[PDB]
Amino acid sequence: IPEYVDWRQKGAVTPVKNQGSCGSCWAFSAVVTIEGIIKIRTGNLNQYSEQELLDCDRRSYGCNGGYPWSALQLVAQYGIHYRNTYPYEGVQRYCRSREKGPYAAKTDGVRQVQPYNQGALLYSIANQPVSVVLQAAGKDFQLYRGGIFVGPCGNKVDHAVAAVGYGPNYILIKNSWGTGWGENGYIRIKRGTGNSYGVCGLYTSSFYPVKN
Ligand SMILES: *CC(=O)[C@H](CCCCN)NS(=O)(=O)c1ccc(C)cc1
């Protein structure tokens, strides 16, 4: 369980993206999750469509609300297309999955990490990236243009992102905003403080598919 875990230089995460004026934190977080695992075994890095997840997942409320843990489940159940055969537009619409044709990616299950346990988060993040939530409605996290976020912030979780590494002290997160935020679309939050919930409630509820 290395002292350092970066999947970027591991060839697991692709360039950064933006959800835009679409409240669709959840579908993006997912595509990265599934994505990671998909490349971890096969040795093939891919960019899947979040747009599809939006238009297809009726359980989620597309362009403004969702469950990073429906998306995944969805995929495993059905599947998910490339981000070319289903590029992101930013507006929820009619499911094209079927109309689009044969799927391209399809997992083999979804599991959740025991909330409120850093030790647990890491491990999984060590075996493969994960979808995690937190407080973004933040007025500080909103302004982050590079650094180690300690706060201030709260325990009112409401935005989903992704963890793509950690250090002895900083946890790495991929944001669904442009590369005109944090440190090039990236933000480092601090771990090991005692805060069980985890600063910004980053330890509330996390997840991930399964792959054979
Ligand atoms: C996570 C997400 O999509 C939310 C909106 C949820 C709304 C539920 N009522 N917004 S966001 O945090 O991604 C966001 C998007 C655009 C901007 C300018 C700020 C934040």
List the catalytic residue out of 22, 63, 81, 159. Answer: 159
Report helix, strand or coil for 17. coil
Strands 186-190 and 148-149: parallel
Is 165 within 8 Å of 4 (Cβ atoms)? yes
For residue 64 and ligand 1, the question of a CB distance below 6 A is answered with yes
Residue 159: closest CA among 86, 62, 67, 93: 67
Domain-wise residue ranges, the chain: 1-212
Report helix, strand or coil for 30. helix
Q: Would residue 155 show up in a list of annotated catalytic residues for this protein?
A: no
Token pair belonging to 170: 């900083």
Q: Would residue 25 show up in a list of annotated catalytic residues for this protein?
A: yes
Token pair belonging to 63: 């362009």
Write out the H or E segment, with its range, that includes residue 55: helix 50-56
Q: Name the class of domain 1-212.
A: alpha beta
Q: Would residue 200 show up in a list of annotated catalytic residues for this protein?
A: no
Residue 23: closest CA among 62, 60, 59: 62
Query: Is 95 known as a binding-site position?
Result: no
Residue 205 CB partners (closer than 8 Å, separation 6+): 69, 112, 115, 132, 133, 157
The residue type of 162 is A
Is 68 within 8 Å of 131 (Cβ atoms)? yes
Report helix, strand or coil for 116. coil
The residue nearest atom 4 of ligand 1, judged by CA position, is 23
Residue 13 to residue 169: CA distance in whole angstroms: 21
The residue nearest atom 11 of ligand 1, judged by CA position, is 23
Longest dimension (CA), the chain: 50
Residue 70 to residue 52: CA distance in whole angstroms: 13
Is 145 within 8 Å of 182 (Cβ atoms)? yes
Is 74 within 8 Å of 57 (Cβ atoms)? yes
